[PDB]
Design a protein around this nucleic acid. Sequence first.
DNA 1: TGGGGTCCT
DNA 2: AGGACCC
DNA 3: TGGGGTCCT
DNA 4: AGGACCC
Lengths: 367, 367
Amino acid sequence: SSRVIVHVDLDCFYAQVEMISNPELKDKPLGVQQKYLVVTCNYEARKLGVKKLMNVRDAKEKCPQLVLVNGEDLTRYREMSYKVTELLEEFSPVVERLGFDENFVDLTEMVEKRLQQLQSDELSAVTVSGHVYNNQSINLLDVLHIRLLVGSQIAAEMREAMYNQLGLTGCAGVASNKLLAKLVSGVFKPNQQTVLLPESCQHLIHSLNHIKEIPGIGYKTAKCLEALGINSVRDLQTFSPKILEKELGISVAQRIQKLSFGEDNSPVILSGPPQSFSEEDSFKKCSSEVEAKNKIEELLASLLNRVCQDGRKPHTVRLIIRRYYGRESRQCPIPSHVIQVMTPMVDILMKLFRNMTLLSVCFCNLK
Amino acid sequence: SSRVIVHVDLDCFYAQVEMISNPELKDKPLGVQQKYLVVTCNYEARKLGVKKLMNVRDAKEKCPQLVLVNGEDLTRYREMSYKVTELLEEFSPVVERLGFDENFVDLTEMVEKRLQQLQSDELSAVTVSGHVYNNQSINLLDVLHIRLLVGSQIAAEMREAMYNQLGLTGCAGVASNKLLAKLVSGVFKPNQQTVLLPESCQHLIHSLNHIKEIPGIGYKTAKCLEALGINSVRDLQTFSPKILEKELGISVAQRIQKLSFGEDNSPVILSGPPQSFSEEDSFKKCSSEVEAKNKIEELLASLLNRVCQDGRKPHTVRLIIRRYYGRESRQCPIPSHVIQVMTPMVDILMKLFRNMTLLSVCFCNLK
DNA sequence: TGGGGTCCT
DNA sequence: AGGACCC
DNA sequence: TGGGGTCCT
DNA sequence: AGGACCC
């Protein structure tokens, strides 16, 4: 029943991609910006206060030496993202993407195939590659420890190949399910890896400071957990199954309570090609109304080329909005013959507009 | 590009299935009932006024000689339904179900495979099997007429095999798309078949008396069409694309307007095994409230056995309701280990009940 | 106006 | 989750 | 608080 | 269609 999962997490991904394109930014503290935000920055900058998602100003007045590059156009990041995934796919086919810079790979079959290949002998010489989560002692006679170590060896090879073939660094974490692998991948933050032995599971999960830090617990369930008194991971573990059942509903509840013990049975799912391609414009005050379909000609132009390329054709169009959490969409089929340019598409987007701080087009339901 | 589609439509299906089970009903006018309704009756009864979906009383006082059988339990009808479909599948694999008693089969490849097998000779001796829609003359030199005739030959073989192997009669209609095949299957009503030549398409579509008779136009779009003045099929054909576009939305509108010309590009889709299994109880006044989960133990019992059997296991449960058009549901996952009896299931159905004229359970999302 | 079932938003 | 379609 | 993306109800 | 999650 037991699995060996690796979580691969690329360091400051857009900044890496930009640092490869312009090497005069390598030494220099680098911010990648979108509108008013600094969405990511390389190491040099991070250390001098720049962070997470700061202002192009609250972030410049915490570091004047800031280089900025625009990363609103996601194209190159998207391409390198799939290069990474394809590369992990070549190790083992079942790879799951999470955003552009994370991948889970189920290494179970591969770890076993290596283990069967060793003679009862070199097995005593199995070693770990990278850190062991809470500096825990390894027991070479524990079959689960041996498998996880062989998994940390695959992980280090994924990272070496990602570096040698694509020029990217990143972290990895090896554990027995996706929750834990992703929790432990970030213990040694910059370009390192960690393996979690079973005995330190509670240590890792109790090292969290709030239940929002558990992947799967979002902005909204966390506010509901709070309203109940639940704040630490231990409060969640010990809370009444009943009340939570009856309050977040059986599904959400009996799932996030397992997560609070480090238990998570969800399989790594094969992502394969994307289910949709969409593009957005942000702009606060700026869409008057009707005139700003011009906007609508551009996301199309961009998208059309991308949609093209993949080969597969979209059979659904969608348009999205906000005014001054709440966004609206209208969907419709894409007329069959127009599948097989812009012209009629703009038109069907323009009643999808009229039946109805930002605008987007999505191509969904590819075939 | 051109297709040959057959629509197979079983005569008074539940009554046939019951007439096979109890032959002392064969001569006798037979109603199959559910609650207060006579949902179907065989020929003998139909002719003496009994119809469609009448009262067990407004229908008995239009015919006192009525035998009634209960057909609330859909089990045997459901089994014979799939026997029919499997039998048509053996002619050509792409068969689409519509309710328990209709199937579309795309005969295009099969008609061509027969045509290639004939020598330039016997081709002049191709004949039709059954009626030609508006008594239209056949042109043996028209390649579309020849294909449709070979399609009426496949149809007659489907009907003979359905009769010889399963003991069921029914109608068939052969045409160039599903709209037309289904429109023309019912021209000769009891146990006969009709083939539609292209030149009589407008005749058939204008023989309709209201646009609700066009398959795809339902209760709600028909009321909207009315509100616009649109009543005949010809009003719909001639109505402003624009207004209708802008009023039912581009998708519904540009689709039902094509239908009003007899044009319909939708493929016959392979139904294969069912996407869900559900059971219902009706009862007006009767669910007090909480106590009537007892109800909830039964639909389960029934369902569990069925779900079992198919082999494939449901990963989603759902519960449905109405109070005194509008029904409510709550869905949730089925706990993994309980996939692999009743006990915990009733329980997860009973919070799905408490977060919340009739009740039902659905097993969906089989795997 | 039963007792099913499918796909779309 | 709910609407809309079909039998 | 960008500019993407996925699955569920 | 909209909510909820993740990066």
